[PDB]
Design an enzyme around this catalytic site. Structure first.
Site: not given
Ligand SMILES: O=C(O)c1cnc2ccccc2c1O
Length: 437
Positions: A102, A327
Site C-alpha cells: 500500500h 483517500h
Molecule cells: O490505495 C490503497 O491503499 C487501496 C487499496 N485497496 C483498495 C481496494 C479497493 C478500492 C480501493 C483501494 C485502495 O485505494
C-alpha cells in the site's frame, strides 16, 4: 512554511482552494529538479497515464514500479509497462496471507540532488481528480562529495530509517536506490518515518514498524502534559478492517494504547474516527463512484456494529474539500478545545490490523501483513511544545495545516457508514445515478 504538507489539486473547487495544492504534473515538473531516474512505489498503476504525467523531456528516463501484484494481476501490470522500454518493475514479496503493498512513495533522482515524496494517491487519474489526498515533499537533498565521510543523517534519523524500510524488501532493484540514498545528505529532514512491512517482529525488532513504531517515537520524542487524558485521539481513514467483536479486542486495547502514548512515564481519552457516511459519498463531486475507493464490505461491517458509534462525518470546509472524498489517511492528538495538536501523522495506513500490526504469541510478537508508509510531525522536531492548528488551510508560519474541520461532527441518527458492496437506490447522486454493485 516548515512542514511541506500539501493536498492534491481538486477539479471543481474555486481557485483559492487549489492555490497551495499540488498536481502530479507539478511534482514531476523540471522546476523541482532535472530528472535522472525515479522509483514509483504504489498499489494501483495506470502506466499510460503515469508516463504522460512526467514532462515530455523526461519521459524516457528510467522508472521503477514497486508493486505487490501476483499471478494474473502481475501479468497485467507487466503488459501495461512493456510498451515503455525505460520502465522496470519490482514485485514486493508478500509472504503473509492477505497482505498488500500500500506504500505510496516517489524517489526522484536529479542532476541537482535527490527528493523523497511520501503521499496517499494511487497512480491513476481518478485518485488525483476529485479526492482529498495528502503529500509530504522532502527538501532537495544534496549529494555528498566523493571522498567526504559524513553521515548525512537528520536528528529524526530519517536517512537510516528510510534505508531500513527499503532493506526489508530484499530486492536487487531497491539495493541500487539504497546506494543512491547513502550518497546523499538528508540532514535537513524534520519528520520521522513510520513504516509497516510484512512479518512477525519480536525483541529488538518489535519497535521497528507499525503501531509499536509510533508508540516508541511518542515515548522518546513527545512530552506528556497535565490533563493529557483530556486530549482526544483522532483517526481519519478510507477503509476499515475486521477489528474484532468488541473494542477491547484491538481498537481500544493495543491500537489506542499506542496512540495515547506521550513521554517516558507509565483510559477515558475520547477517540474520534472520521469516515465518510453514505450521504457524504452521495453528495460528493464524484457521486457514488467515490465509494469504489472506500472499500468497507458489508461482511466486515456487520460483525462490528459497535464500531460505528465512534464514526464522525467527513467535513473539510477549512480546505474547501467537504465534497472531495478522502483517500488521505491521518492520525493526530488535538488539545481538548482542538486549538493545538501534540502531533500529526499522514500515512497510507487505514484502520486495520493488517496495516498497523496485531500482537501475537502472548504479547511478544507484532504481526504485520502489509507495506505502509507515512511521516510523523512532532513539535520537538521543530523546536516547539505543540502545534497551533491553522484555522484556514490555505490562509505565524508555525501553525499546522489540518486539512479537515475540527471538532469532528458525529454521525446523525439517520447516517450510516459508507459500505461499498450493497446497493443505494433511495436517492440519486450528483450525476443522477444510483449504486448497484
Ligand atoms: O490505495 C490503497 O491503499 C487501496 C487499496 N485497496 C483498495 C481496494 C479497493 C478500492 C480501493 C483501494 C485502495 O485505494
Amino acid at each position: 512554511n516548515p512542514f511541506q504538507f500539501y493536498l492534491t489539486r481538486v477539479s471543481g473547487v474555486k481557485p483559492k482552494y487549489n492555490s497551495g495544492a499540488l498536481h502530479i504534473k507539478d511534482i514531476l515538473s523540471p522546476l523541482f529538479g532535472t530528472l535522472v531516474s525515479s522509483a514509483q512505489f504504489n498499489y494501483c498503476f495506470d502506466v499510460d497515464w503515469l508516463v504522460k504525467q512526467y514532462p515530455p523531456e523526461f519521459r524516457k528516463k528510467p522508472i521503477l514500479l514497486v508493486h505487490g501484484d501476483k499471478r494474473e494481476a502481475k501479468a497485467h501490470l507487466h503488459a501495461q509497462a512493456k510498451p515503455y522500454e525505460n520502465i522496470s518493475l519490482c514485485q514486493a514479496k508478500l509472504d503473509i496471507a492477505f497482505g498488500t503493498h500500500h506504500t505510496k512513495m516517489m524517489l526522484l533522482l536529479y542532476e541537482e540532488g535527490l527528493r523523497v515524496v511520501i503521499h496517499t494517491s494511487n497512480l491513476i487519474h481518478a485518485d488525483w481528480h476529485q479526492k482529498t489526498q495528502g503529500i509530504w515533499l522532502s527538501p532537495l537533498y544534496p549529494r555528498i562529495a566523493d571522498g567526504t565521510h559524513k553521515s548525512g543523517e537528520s536528528p529524526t534519523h530519517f536517512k537510516a530509517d528510510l534505508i531500513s524500510y527499503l532493506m526489508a524488501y530484499n530486492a536487487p532493484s531497491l539495493k541500487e536506490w539504497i546506494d543512491v540514498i547513502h550518497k546523499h545528505d538528508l540532514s535537513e529532514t524534520n519528520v520521522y518515518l513510520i513504516g509497516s512491512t510484512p512479518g512477525r517482529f519480536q525483541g529488538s525488532q518489535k519497535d521497528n514498524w507499525g503501531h509499536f513504531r509510533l508508540k516508541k517515537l511518542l515515548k522518546d520524542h513527545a512530552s506528556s502534559m497535565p490533563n493529557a487524558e483530556s486530549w482526544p485521539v483522532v483517526g481519519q481513514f478510507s477503509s476499515v478492517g475486521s477489528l474484532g467483536a468488541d473494542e477491547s479486542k484491538w481498537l481500544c486495547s493495543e491500537f489506542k494504547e499506542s496512540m495515547l502514548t506521550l513521554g517516558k512515564e507509565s483510559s477515558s481519552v475520547p477517540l474520534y474516527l472520521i469516515y465518510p457516511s453514505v450521504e457524504n459519498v452521495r453528495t460528493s463531486l464524484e457521486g457514488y463512484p467515490a465509494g469504489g475507493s472506500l472499500p468497507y464490505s458489508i461482511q466486515t461491517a456487520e460483525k462490528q456494529n459497535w464500531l460505528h458509534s465512534y464514526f464522525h462525518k467527513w467535513s473539510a470546509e477549512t480546505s474547501g474539500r467537504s465534497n472531495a472524498m478522502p483517500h488521505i489517511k491521518t492520525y493526530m492528538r488535538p488539545s481538548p478545545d482542538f486549538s493545538k495538536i501534540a502531533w500529526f501523522l499522514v500515512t497510507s495506513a487505514n484502520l486495520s490490523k493488517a496495516a498497523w500490526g496485531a500482537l501475537e504469541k502472548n504479547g511478544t510478537q507484532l504481526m504485520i501483513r502489509s507495506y505502509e508508509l507515512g511521516v510523523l510531525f512532532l513539535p520537538s522536531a521543530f523546536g516547539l511544545d505543540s502545534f497551533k492548528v491553522k484555522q484556514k488551510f490555505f490562509a505565524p508560519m508555525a501553525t499546522f495545516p489540518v486539512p479537515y474541520d475540527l471538532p469532528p461532527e458525529l454521525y446523525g441518527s439517520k447516517d450510516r457508514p459508507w459500505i461499498w458492496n450493497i446497493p443505494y437506490v433511495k436517492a440519486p447522486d450528483t450525476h443522477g445515478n444510483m449504486w448497484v454493485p
